[PDB]
Amino acid sequence: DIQMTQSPSFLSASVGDRVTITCRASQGISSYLAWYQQKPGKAPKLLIYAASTLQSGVPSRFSGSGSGTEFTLTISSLQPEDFATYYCQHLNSYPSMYTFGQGTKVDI
Amino acid sequence: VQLVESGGGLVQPGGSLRLSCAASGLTVSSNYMNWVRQAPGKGLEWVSVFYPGGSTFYADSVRGRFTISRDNSKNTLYLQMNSLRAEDTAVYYCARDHSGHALDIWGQGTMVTVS
Amino acid sequence: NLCPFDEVFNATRFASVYAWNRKRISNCVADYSVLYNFAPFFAFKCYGVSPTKLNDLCFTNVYADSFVIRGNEVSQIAPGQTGNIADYNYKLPDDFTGCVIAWNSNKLDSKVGGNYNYRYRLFRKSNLKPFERDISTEIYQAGNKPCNGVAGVNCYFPLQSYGFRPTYGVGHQPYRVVVLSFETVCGP
DSSP: OOOEEESOOEEEOOSSSOEEEEEEETTOOOSOOOEEEOOTTSOOEEEEOTTTOOOTTSOTTEEOOOBTTEEEEEEOSOOSSOOOEEEOOBOOSTTTOOBOOSOEEEEO | OEEEEEOOEEEOTTOOEEEEEEEESSOTTTSEEEEEEEOTTSOEEEEEEEOSSSOBOOOGGGTTTEEEEEETTTTEEEEEEOOOTTTSOEEEEEEEESSSSOBOOOOOOEEEEEO | OBOTHHHHHTOSSOOOSSSOEEOOBOSSBOOTTHHHHHSOOSEEEEESSOSGGGTTOEESOBOOEEEEEESTTGGGSSSSOOSHHHHHTOOOOSSOOEEEEEEEOTTTTSOSSOOTTOEEEOOOSSOOOSSOOOOOOOOOOOSSSOOOSSOTTTOOOSEEEOOOOTTSOTTSSEEEEEEEEBOOEEOO
16 A cells, blocks of 8 residues: 655745645555646646646646656746645555545645 | 536435436546545545446445446436445545546536535 | 476566467476476465366366566456456456466566556456457547547547556566466376
8 A cells, every 4th residue: 555645735835936846655656646736616627647748728837747756746837826726646456546645735 | 528417415314315427528338437525625535436347446435335326328427325424524526537547527516415 | 298387487578468478288297396496476376276286187278378467456367356457458267277376577577767568458348258358459439429540539549558667666566477277288
């Protein structure tokens, strides 16, 4: 079994600067990990999947690259609409399957 | 593709509810479909999964009381629950899996509270 | 005439699970004791037969199916069972008479920075009948809309690539599994 945890938890980031998020996986990990964005009171939408694949409709503003245990995502632009929450996952073996781990919060 | 979900409301402890996942654009009998739970002000959790074949895997916390079903006649996905006060107090989501790990088409949540 | 169990086990390169090799070992002396002496094992299990009493038995056909599976997915190779590998790549029968051999290969099978060669069938319309194989690379169809050749959206390439690197955990490490189905072949 593996446990997914995120270090930043709450953060404070201004419009001018960028934000970097990291989530760790115990006992190693494959290359399959997805990042989600969930504005409060809205169903979350896929943002980045697999190894920095990027998705149609997701702006090129977002880019999340990593390998092995250390995984991270970074936002380059000024974040006009201040984003709210972000999550990790990774599909597993029979008993656990989808593991999301602790959430993350970023704001002004 | 849209995944509109119905059902919900309030059910007393020990009661029962069913939720239907209406999908127009993708075949329920051909894609990995699953149920995702989110208690208010907390992270997300995984409930069920339903392969193209006659297979189904449940999480430990929702095993034996939660049953999933698929009907190709209405092209919809159903989840049957026999609720408990702390087992079901969350919004429920319906999703599809593209590459075996990523859930893209997330439907609107349905509030299912117990009291 | 010793059976070619030496050739099956020490293959330099195995195949992916979706296209699994098969060898009809017939008309030779088995001598199953060679397995333990040379290759250490991870999950040596037998159904319907016994390991020690394997040599003093006679069979007409002893098959041999070989592939490479993730470590945490080796357990799906067993009678019945449901999963990504068992249901859609290689399904063993219920009344199964044979042995399943699994041993780690992270020392050799793992590559320097990528082993995208190995693939498994993520998408299939229905489960496999026991002891079957599908090597079709046609684009899968999701949704009532007709599916064109290009994958794009709502059409997927079925096969998905393993990621093998030496730093990965024991769960995601490569494994080698050989299944010897049973059915002249009498060991010494």
